[PDB]
Amino acid sequence: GPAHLPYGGIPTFARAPLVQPDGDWQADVAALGVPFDIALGFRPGARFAPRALREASLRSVPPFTGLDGKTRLQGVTFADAGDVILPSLEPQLAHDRITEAARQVRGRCRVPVFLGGDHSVSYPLLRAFADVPDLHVVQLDAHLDFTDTRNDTKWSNSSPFRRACEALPNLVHITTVGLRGLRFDPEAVAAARARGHTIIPMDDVTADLAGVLAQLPRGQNVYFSVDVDGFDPAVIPGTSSPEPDGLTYAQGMKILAAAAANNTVVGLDLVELAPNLDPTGRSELLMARLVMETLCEVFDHVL
Amino acid sequence: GPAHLPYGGIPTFARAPLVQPDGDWQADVAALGVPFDIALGFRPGARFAPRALREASLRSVPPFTGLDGKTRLQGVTFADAGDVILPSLEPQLAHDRITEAARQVRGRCRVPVFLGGDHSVSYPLLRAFADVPDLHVVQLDAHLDFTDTRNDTKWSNSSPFRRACEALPNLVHITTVGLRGLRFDPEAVAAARARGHTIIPMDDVTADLAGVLAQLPRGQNVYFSVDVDGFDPAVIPGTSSPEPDGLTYAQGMKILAAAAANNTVVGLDLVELAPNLDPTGRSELLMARLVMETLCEVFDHVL
Amino acid sequence: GPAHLPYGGIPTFARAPLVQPDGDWQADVAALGVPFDIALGFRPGARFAPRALREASLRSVPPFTGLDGKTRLQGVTFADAGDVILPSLEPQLAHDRITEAARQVRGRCRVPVFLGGDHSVSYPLLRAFADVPDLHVVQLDAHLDFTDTRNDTKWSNSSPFRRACEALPNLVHITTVGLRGLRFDPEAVAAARARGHTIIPMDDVTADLAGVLAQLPRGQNVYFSVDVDGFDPAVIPGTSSPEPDGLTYAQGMKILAAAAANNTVVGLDLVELAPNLDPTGRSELLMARLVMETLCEVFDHVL
Amino acid sequence: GPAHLPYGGIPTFARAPLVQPDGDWQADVAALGVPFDIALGFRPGARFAPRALREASLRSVPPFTGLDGKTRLQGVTFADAGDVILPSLEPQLAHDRITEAARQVRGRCRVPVFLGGDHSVSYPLLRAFADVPDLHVVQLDAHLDFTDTRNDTKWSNSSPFRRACEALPNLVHITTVGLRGLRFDPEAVAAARARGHTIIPMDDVTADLAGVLAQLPRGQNVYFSVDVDGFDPAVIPGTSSPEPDGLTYAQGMKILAAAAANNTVVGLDLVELAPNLDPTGRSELLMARLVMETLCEVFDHVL
Amino acid sequence: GPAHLPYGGIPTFARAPLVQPDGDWQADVAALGVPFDIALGFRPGARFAPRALREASLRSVPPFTGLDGKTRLQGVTFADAGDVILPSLEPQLAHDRITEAARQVRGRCRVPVFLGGDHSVSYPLLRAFADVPDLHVVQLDAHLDFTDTRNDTKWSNSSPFRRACEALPNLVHITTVGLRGLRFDPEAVAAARARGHTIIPMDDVTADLAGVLAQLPRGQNVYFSVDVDGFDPAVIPGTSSPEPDGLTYAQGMKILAAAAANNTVVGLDLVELAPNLDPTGRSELLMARLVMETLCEVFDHVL
Amino acid sequence: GPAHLPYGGIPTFARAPLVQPDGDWQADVAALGVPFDIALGFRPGARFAPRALREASLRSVPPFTGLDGKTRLQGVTFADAGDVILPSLEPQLAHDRITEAARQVRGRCRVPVFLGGDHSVSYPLLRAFADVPDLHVVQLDAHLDFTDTRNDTKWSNSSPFRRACEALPNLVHITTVGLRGLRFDPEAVAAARARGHTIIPMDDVTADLAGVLAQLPRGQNVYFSVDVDGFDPAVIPGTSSPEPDGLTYAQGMKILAAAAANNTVVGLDLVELAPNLDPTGRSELLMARLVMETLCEVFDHVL
């Protein structure tokens, strides 16, 4: 029958049916929003990202038939579990709400998609994956975000992965791609290298993308964490702290596609999108497509 | 339990449960969006109004306890039937789907709320009230919008009530308040007076508000049509063609309040809001509140 | 035949035919733009005002038939003489070009309309009225703009009327209405008072508009200078240096209408509009209408 | 010597010299910024308010010679103590630092000026006045902000005065002006009325301003708290949660001027300004002027 | 002697004299605007493109002397035929208005430049070339736009070339370059391949541009259709539905240049520009330049 | 002691202490702003660049430890000398004040950093380097800016280097990189080559960046002039007159890094940034970083 235009209808991710995190449902893919941005240290706005991403996803409703007539995500079911009910302030309670909602959504779908929210949400999100043996994380990011303490707190967006690792012994490895900038936390760098994490600077992606893909995990359980600031600001300006010369959409997608075809993807988060910082709206439109395209890749290699 | 903050959760009007127009449900108040703006003659954007109003309504979730301790809308149930599935172009087809959806929603609730969309939507919207005896329309508008033909079309936003009157013999009277501007369609004015419609220029409201309220219907079946451009552009700048020296929120609400308490309100539409034209977002916030406050007035004097 | 919508066609003031300042033409009203804003002391943008005003005037193309069915500006011819060709910097050269173009335009129309541009343009514009006996200026403005020197220059926008008076012995009186703000140049205020100029603070307008209209000139040759910041910033926010609690559109219009009904209007300038500072676009829309409505009043009482 | 233009120089409040809160200085007036906005429940941005207000204050540098030729704030010294060094998250720590910095600034000046920041900062700010006998607070606000708990926290901006009262037995009375809206916390309203607070709805100001001025404290130790949302959104749209029909700049200023003429002003805060929500920039220009004008009134009646 | 700066003068394309489509004039190049955008399915704004392009063209007024000292477009005359007078709605009438105006302009110049407008305008525009033998079209676009039916209409901006081909058997071939995205209409793709149209995905331009150029027509009558969304969103963000990883300005220009060097160019349209979606203004500045540079290429290879 | 987050504290360049140009101080690096933009010929805004650059520099406070573990800018002291006090208009007086302030700053630091301001400030800035033997200028720019007269003035931003060369016989050579665009001043190109100046078009950079670095000066006294428009508009859209296909941040930096490693850097200016033209704020963030990264290269290799 007739379908809504992007500007029509209630905005749910992939225009999927709306459900409750603890409701009686099941789907191949389930979206969950985390409108939390009080942990970032510069420009707020990421709390509006979940809503912006849902709206932008109406431009990319599955399934998809490419120029080659091949159709992806054909038959794959989606669901939108709404957003985590967050309190004001109270970061600890917020973290607990996030982990609980994440647990519920995880048990009702195959591949859960978390929409941030600043990067600090990745920590409580990952806590819902403690039972995943030898959990690996493929992180697209301009920064390492493995810092211990910053501005007198352990919960800033610069510390999510540091917090996750000390709370999840099953999180055995992180591969970070896209790092750049004038400042790096030496303590954080040393801590990541001490745990054997893989650090891939944007310089290496530019110099030899093939070699970078050859460094990605294989036959592993992988959780994808995409910080939109990993992408070049020209491409995705909507983010609090942009760094020049980043990933093109194509490069970021190639890394995600490669990792999705050789691993068991257990989930993915999309964080640091700041809609208010991009009045052209391309940031959310492109990141919404990124998620959908990644899912296409994920389900094109399910065993 | 805990409640979402305005930036959290899926945006449904008044944060009410989502439903289908011809679905199996019933409620006191039901919202229906009509993201149609190709009929206006200047600045587009109203197609995004339904979505903006839903989001802004999260700042005004019922019920409401005033400073006097009194609570309003207690026990009143709300529902959101989404938006009419409109085609691209094809105005005649759009009109038919609008009316059908309006009919379906009106038969499932007591007071239906229609979110435009340019003012031309009022026509196919009123066609769903053909069975209301001696139907009266109280319209807040900077313009009369009773034009026959404009720019070689009969379906522009300048002709909704002219179209509605020729298609509905039961629509017996219209009271338009807030009229102003340098240009008036003489043929439209003549046709309106010929039918005995009441025309109340903004000057009348300014000179004597009490006299204006005395001209409102009493004990009649009333359909409310609120064109946001009836309000002063300083108050509501988010609209295609603003006209200086309009209604303050308070004046417009006083009119709606008086009419609501003295009549049987059969419905209401809120049109011409253009979110894209007000980056401060106050336009949607105030108009979302206007709809809720009007509803407070309506259900506060139910017989 | 069919007429363009506001967004269609080449933007000329009031959609009037385009002409050259010294060309072979004659019209009742002729517009001339002065896209000069390098003399203001705060936020630039007024250089774009002439263009924005033309675009906005397409929403106010004459003639106008009001609610009473009466028509104004019927048969009144319009022309757009384009813009003065300004150099970069070189204020004195710019001034000479503005005066020359204004003189040429004045000699080919009854009422010239000058679109600024920061307020400093009023000086060279006025030099073109050296032959007007006992020239009076009715100035709507939040600021006096009668300063001798400011920031080491004689040509800032804070000095146009001071420069005008010293260059035109025939400019015998100025009536300034709308003044407000924490700071005033004591020398400028005292000099204006000592010259017999009339200073009407906004507080007087609020306290007794009737008393203010009674202070306006009668039977004089009047030049209207409208600085948009004379209007309340809530109404017209698009201006460099806004001051709270100003004229509503209605008050400013009543003042101009009163003066137009009892005097011989020789010209009008509209200055300090900064379109870039009002993304809602209501500033240029309302100010273009003010010019058109003022002309309606002018030609309704011309002798 | 030449003076800077508004867009020139380093932006310190009123172009005052920069000092450390606990440094070796003394001045009549001292500004202290609190760029904290993680406690608000809707739209962020107030963290940028202290900076925006400083920049805007460059348009209002003291002293001021008015239209009447009289000068105010002549010889009155100013100091800018910078901003409280805030951590990320960690509300309690932020609170303690805010109180400590405020105490130190207070002991070094006659009248401290605090620039927020969301309204939650008023709580830690007021703790620095625990020694003031019979401390009265005059609050301009659209909301009461006397809530005990909201969204699972005691520190939201909706609870500053509630926290202040239960922590300051010397805070004997609060006069709140401008209240309006559909939703009010019944528990908060009751608790406030019970403690003997004076609640003055905006409707009261509209109906009789003279009466409202008579309800203000007299001969008391007064702390001013100005929430920019107390002003009408058409005038000051840059704020998280606007409410229609608020104070005009003039009405708000009349209230402050009245209170400043009959009491001993011990301090003032300006909170909830969101520059990012007003691209016209009028919100910060007008609120910076409000602070300066209030200081003019305070020093005109120094006992 | 002196010339206007970009912000000065009436904005006509290339600052060319204004003429009527059916007036008595002749010029090498003539521009015609089609401010129509009610056919697109997402974000409106293209109706303002013709005006934005005209304004932006003031930064690219011919002739042009390059770094090598060689001048292009020397002696090439220009004219601006204004905009097609469009009705409100009534797509079929608009289509006829467009075709007739386009033919009139075509009979008075050598190369016509059409300024859109959503991509649907290409259909009625092409009907004006029904008298051209073996008409070839070189289409820069992110989408094929060869769809038959979409959202219950035949006239959406997704069907222009489909409508053109079935109405113009003389349009023997189309070469589309820049195709990309997750969704492709299998029906449209088939109909295109069937007619033998050449489809060149953006991946092919990236893989080997020289190969793509070798696929362009030679010695044919060619019409250029440039959809701005064919360019990368980072470069041209001002467009309704952006797609990542597109043409750089240089790539698009290389394609246009190659085709203009060995073909008879009969016209060109520039569509889907949405100035309202790019507040930096680079979208219109770059596309106006693209048109002018394309003309430089065309007149550098005339037989 | 704790450190301010980017949105906290008074915005001075690199959070450096404030000083007066002719005060008693010394520092390795000193910043001086020149908020002058009345000489540009298109879109103003550059007057706001010094303040935006200072605000943005708070995200790049020295020293910097890279991913490789090396730390740069260690032991490098900074000072912010504020802004040159500019008059209104009076370009000659402005020039004199700029030169004088630059002289004072240069005599108190090792590497002065000048924040513009339109490009015309480079002329009076360079006059402060008259005692530098065989002075060389490495200019990143989309335009040559070696024009004699433009729009009836010798002081436009298109003439800074022409004016500098005729005033400074010691300015023996200029290397300009990034030139592009359809129009070039033939008289300026000829005069530049006549003097042996090296012109390096963007095409050369794209074709062989290694070769361009090879063409940079070696062992000379070099003054860096960075016009942000030398960069691609997709990367840095905030500038008056953008030209497509410009330098990536990386390319521009590589050029500066190379020159800084093989020459004595006497100073650097950063001009034409227009914060108001880039609402995403990435323009000032990337350019402030550029200045800081250039400084780290300078001190990491100085003789």
Side-chain angles (χ1 to χ4, degrees), chain F residues 129-136 167-173:
Chain F
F129 294 74
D131 69 359
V132 179
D134 301 300
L135 180 61
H136 285 236
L168 303 161
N170 65 297
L171 202 181
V172 304
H173 185 265

Side-chain angles (χ1 to χ4, degrees), chain F residues 11-31:
Chain F
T12 51
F13 198 71
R15 219 177 268 293
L18 176 58
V19 302
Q20 305 310 304
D22 72 321
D24 173 48
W25 59 274
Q26 293 176 56
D28 294 312
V29 177

Side-chain angles (χ1 to χ4, degrees), chain C residues 4 7 9 47 51 55 83, chain E residues 4 7 9 47 51 55 83:
Chain C
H4 276 299
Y7 49 96
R47 62 220 275 156
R51 185 163 294 171
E55 298 172 358
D83 293 345
Chain E
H4 281 299
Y7 48 87
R47 60 212 279 167
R51 186 162 298 169
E55 297 174 358
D83 296 337

Side-chain angles (χ1 to χ4, degrees), chain C residues 46-101:
Chain C
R47 62 220 275 156
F48 307 121
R51 185 163 294 171
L53 283 164
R54 292 183 166 100
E55 298 172 358
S57 73
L58 299 189
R59 274 271 55 176
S60 300
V61 182
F64 306 99
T65 308
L67 181 59
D68 51 30
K70 302 175 64 291
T71 300
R72 286 186 295 180
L73 292 182
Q74 174 63 196
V76 179
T77 63
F78 283 70
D80 187 329
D83 293 345
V84 179
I85 297 177
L86 303 168
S88 284
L89 297 174
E90 308 297 317
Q92 191 166 303
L93 172 58
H95 294 167
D96 294 340
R97 288 196 187 159
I98 294 167
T99 299
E100 177 57 6

